[model samples]
Target: KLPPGWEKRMSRXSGRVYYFNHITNASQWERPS
Candidate 1:
């Protein structure tokens, strides 16, 4: 879960343009045979 005040910070004019959580690339998670 996102931390508190993160939304406010993220909404700032100079804040992050994009944000994502719990995301992973399928290929990266694949076993390395």
Candidate 2:
């Protein structure tokens, strides 16, 4: 799916989908490069 520790999440109100790396505490607008 994504890089290490990276996962997908959605904003119920923002009407957006996001991806994050929990191990690095980083995030992306959608699918990260």
Candidate 3:
């Protein structure tokens, strides 16, 4: 089963990206600061 906030994304550096839940109260993954 998938999580409540699971998502899929695509990037030029990589290819397919997958993430679950928040990083900093947000619902998606972000680049490093």
Candidate 4:
């Protein structure tokens, strides 16, 4: 499931979908737990 403060966004640099964790300031290509 999408965690708190986690967002689904597209990277302009990579032109792909990604997940961003605002709390931890981390990013991943796959869905976050």
Candidate 5:
């Protein structure tokens, strides 16, 4: 599950979805492999 207050945004180039943490003001483009 996603964290509380976290929002979903889309990338213009790759059209990949990402998450942004409002509480921490951080962004996660991709997860570690």
Candidate 6:
């Protein structure tokens, strides 16, 4: 899917943001880097 290493940062940022939104008990609620 994603271009090799591109997915790492992309997924990390996405996961952070998603967790911030979906994870009711999230410790980091700010926007992803």
Deviation in Å, model 1, residue 12 alpha carbon: 8.8
Query: Mind giving the per-residue lDDT tens digits that candidate 3 earns over 1-33?
Result: 444544555646777564434543333464322
Candidate 2, residues 1-33: lDDT per residue as tens digits? 687899887868775888878999898886876
| Predicted candidate 6 versus true structure: per-residue lDDT over 1-33, tens digit per residue | 322222222245444432232323333344344
In model 1, which regions exceed 4 Å deviation?
8-33
Give one clash count per candidate, in the order shown: 0, 0, 0, 0, 0, 0
Per-model TM-score on C-alpha atoms: 0.19, 0.62, 0.29, 0.70, 0.46, 0.16
Candidate 3: give the clashing pairs: none
Model 1 worst lDDT run, 10 consecutive residues: 24-33
Model 3, CA-based lDDT: 0.48
What is the TM-score of candidate 1?
0.19
lDDT of 1 at 26: 20
Scanning candidate 4 in windows of ten residues, the lowest lDDT window is 8-17
Pick by TM-score: which candidate is best? 4
In order, candidate lDDTs are 0.31, 0.81, 0.48, 0.87, 0.73, 0.33
> What are the per-residue Cα lDDT tens digits for candidate 5 across 1-33?
575867787877777888877788878876412
Q: Tell me how far the alpha carbon of residue 28 in candidate 2 is from the true structure, in angstroms, after superposition.
A: 1.0
Q: What is the lDDT of residue 9 in candidate 3?
A: 56
RMSD of each: 12.0, 1.9, 7.2, 1.3, 3.6, 11.0
Ranking under TM-score, best-scoring first?
A: 4, 2, 5, 3, 1, 6
lDDT at 8, model 1: 18
Q: Which ten residues in a row have the lowest lDDT in candidate 5?
A: 24-33
Alpha carbon lDDT at 21, candidate 6: 27
Cα deviation in Å at residue 25, candidate 1? 31
- After the best TM-score superposition of candidate 3, give how far the Cα of residue 28 lies from its true spot, in angstroms: 11
Span of 10 residues, lowest total lDDT, candidate 2: 9-18
Which predicted model would earn the best lDDT?
4
